[PDB]
């Protein structure tokens, strides 16, 4: 009599809204995948789990108000900057509003992915163009190798990955004048300096290279933590650059999400809904 | 007549970019040839001067004044119990409207679309965090943010489309301690900024609010306010508060005796106050 037409056991799962709530509260993947015998039992369970997550979130915030005095993104930002200053890197801060011409020299499709302000101005989608400019200026006053980096807000109307941030923080460190034979090792050095300062000790370096060049993608498992490029590059011509170089770029909110193992990348980004990884309406 | 030959428009602007002393900017000469020769001498002097300043950045600091002041200010405030926050630089049209004294600022911002724009000030975002935090923590709540703000126009001769604001506030300040709290903030900020000479000018001209202005002579260092305020209603704020805002590149220009406020702002033509074409 085991024919049974009935449905499998624990077939009632979270409603999309319960699921989203548990995610904002950084529930575990196990908790997110829980099934129940029926809706009432599930709703009941939901309330209990939410309750515990809200409690944990409030405790975390206490730490912020009496101890840290600043959220992870800002703590991470100061942490990364000091570590690079100790390695001789000069930190710069450039315009977040860049021109269409600057943007053009970077490739098209990226034009449809940026927030335009008018026909000639837009919010920078990356830090590269601005650092290219500083390279050209600094190379005329300083001796190579020139080490420069910037940590700052970038904007994109859309992106890859399963999640998206219109406003994100990028760390982009570079060295202009790197000896060709040492390029691959510099990228490694940079990755290590950064990942070490970021409290991440588990990661792998993925190198690829095909036609228009040699790229080094830093990752943890199937998780990308950063992408580095190498010069001479195809674009070097438009920016009047002719020295070898290396550059590595990181998404800090993404780094934080991966290090902390949180659910939403928004949890530690610039926000009015979260603070230091905690959803505020708790 | 004697020394009645002055800098040409071009020579004046160039010297201005090089952050000439001002005295140098008013120098006169006996003739047009003696002037140009003086120009060349003074320029190369300022250029050499700029190159050495960049050496301090290259070998000593490793970061420009704006970033140095940012870290210095933040820590100073962390020491006084202020929690630092970082909010969106893109705000809604609805939020901007709740800032309108009455029911103007719209032609001052950069719109991304009919509903979004670049924040021209930090207040709306702080107003929000206030409401949220007050439900989790007991008053007084002390928070601040240092971040980029945007405006198409502003008061004064000089203008930055991109500028850095430090806005520190306290929600729950005892009504009778507001003025003192405003002074406490100004002192904590300016001491950390390297500026000790300053006065606070209260206006109290209500129907607009009990404002305050931090001055360094005829120069403004910051602008502040306090609640209850007629705007608190829209933001569902019911407690007394104090707030003070500082434009960091302006603070820097003032402390360093710089010519263009752009010299220490986000830029591709300047760096740590030094014009890059040498
Ligand atoms: Cl506009
Ligand atoms: Na993404």
SS in 3 state form for A114-138?
CCECCCCEEECCCCHHHHHHHHHHH
Return d(Cα A150, Cα A53) in angstroms, integer. 36
- 8 Å CB contact of B83 and A70: yes
Return d(Cα B28, Cα B46) in angstroms, integer. 18
Return d(Cα A78, Cα B74) in angstroms, integer. 11
Which structure tokens are listed for B7?
């800098």
- 8 Å CB contact of B67 and A272: no
B247 touches B165 (CB < 8 A): yes
Cα A161 to ligand 2 centre (Å): 4
B168 shares its domain with B118: yes
**For residue A89, what is the nearest residue in chain B, using CA coordinates?**
B62
CATH code, B188: 3.30.930.10
Cα A117 to ligand 1 centre (Å): 7
Which of A29, A48, A69 represents a domain boundary (last residue)? A69
A61 shares its domain with A136: no
The number of domains in chain B is 2
CA A15 vs. chain centroid, Å, equals 29
Among residues A142, A221, A273, A277, which one has the least CA distance to residue B274?
A142
Which structure tokens are listed for A2?
């085991």
B26 shares its domain with B119: no
**For residue B95, what is the nearest residue in chain A, using CA coordinates?**
A272
Cα A265 to ligand 1 centre (Å): 29
Return d(Cα A9, Cα B37) in angstroms, integer. 93
Which structure tokens are listed for A150?
């910037």
B45 shares its domain with B99: no
If you count residue pairs, one on A and one on B, with CB atoms under 8 Å apart, how many are there?
A: 107
A99 shares its domain with A144: yes
CATH code, A30: 1.10.287.540
A59 shares its domain with A102: no
CB < 8 Å to B51, chain A? 141
Which of B62, B92, B113 represents a domain boundary (last residue)? B62
Among all ligands shown, which has an atom nearest to the Cα of B152?
A: 1
Domain range for A11 is: 1-69
Q: Residues in chain A, how many?
A: 282
Cα A252 to ligand 2 centre (Å): 12
- 8 Å CB contact of A134 and B271: yes
- 8 Å CB contact of B62 and A91: yes
B173 shares its domain with B230: yes
B216 touches B198 (CB < 8 A): yes
Which of B62, B78, B98 represents a domain boundary (last residue)? B62
Three-state helix/strand/coil letters over chain B: CCCCECCCHHHHHHHHHCCCCCHHHHCCECCHHHHHHHHHHHHHHHHHHHHHHHHHHHHHHCCCHHHHHHHHHHHHHHCCCCEECCCCCEEEHHHHHCCCCCCCCCCCCCEEECCEEECCCCHHHHHHHHHHHCCCCCCCEEEEEEEEEECCCCCCCCCCCEEEEEEEEEECCCHHHHHHHHHHHHHHHHHHHCCCCCEEEECCCCCCCCCEEEEECCEEEEEEEEECCCCCCCCCCCCCEEEEEEEHHHHHHHHHCCCCHHHHCCCCCEECCEECCC
Q: What is the DSSP letter of A219?
A: E
- 8 Å CB contact of B90 and A167: yes
- 8 Å CB contact of A270 and B66: no
B90 shares its domain with B209: yes
Q: Which of B49, B75, B76, B85 to mutate to test the interface with A (most CBs of A within 10 A)?
A: B85
B125 shares its domain with B255: yes
B56 shares its domain with B137: no
A168 touches A157 (CB < 8 A): no
Return d(Cα A149, Cα A134) in angstroms, integer. 10
Return d(Cα A144, Cα A130) in angstroms, integer. 19
- 8 Å CB contact of B58 and A90: yes
Among residues B92, B128, B143, which one has the least CA distance to residue B237?
B128
B16 shares its domain with B101: no
Element (H, E) at A255: helix A252-260
Three-state SS at A194: helix
B147 shares its domain with B192: yes
Q: Which residues pair with B214 in a beta bridge?
A: B200, B222
N-term to C-term CA, chain A: 49
């Amino acid at each position: 009599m085991f024919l049974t037409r009935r449905d499998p056991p624990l077939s009632s799962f979270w409603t999309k809204v319960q699921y989203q709530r548990l995610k904002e509260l950084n529930a575990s993947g196990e908790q997110l995948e829980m099934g129940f015998s029926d809706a009432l039992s599930r709703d009941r369970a939901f309330q209990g789990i939410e309750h515990q997550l809200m409690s944990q979130g409030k405790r975390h915030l206490e730490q912020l108000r009496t101890v840290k005095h600043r959220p992870a993104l800002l703590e991470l930002e100061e942490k990364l900057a000091k570590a690079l200053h100790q390695q001789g890197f000069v930190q710069v801060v450039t315009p977040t509003i860049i021109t269409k011409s600057a943007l053009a020299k970077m490739t098209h499709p990226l034009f449809s992915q940026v927030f335009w302000l008018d026909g000639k101005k837009c919010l920078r989608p990356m830090l590269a163009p601005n650092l290219y400019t500083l390279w050209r200026e600094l190379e005329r006053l300083w001796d190579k190798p020139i080490r420069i980096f910037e940590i700052g807000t970038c904007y994109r109307k859309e992106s890859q990955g399963a999640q998206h941030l219109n406003e994100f923080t990028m760390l982009n460190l570079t060295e202009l004048g790197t000896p060709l034979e040492e390029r691959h090792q510099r990228l490694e050095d940079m990755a290590r300096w950064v990942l070490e300062a970021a409290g991440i000790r588990e990661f792998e370096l993925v190198t690829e290279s095909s036609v228009v060049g040699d790229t080094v993608d830093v990752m943890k498992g199937d998780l990308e933590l950063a992408s580095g490029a190498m010069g001479p590059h195809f674009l070097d011509e438009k920016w009047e650059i002719f020295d070898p170089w290396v550059g590595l770029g990181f998404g800090l909110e993404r780094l934080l999400m991966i290090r902390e193992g949180t659910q939403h990348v928004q949890s530690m980004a610039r926000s009015l809904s979260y603070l230091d990884g905690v959803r505020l309406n708790i």
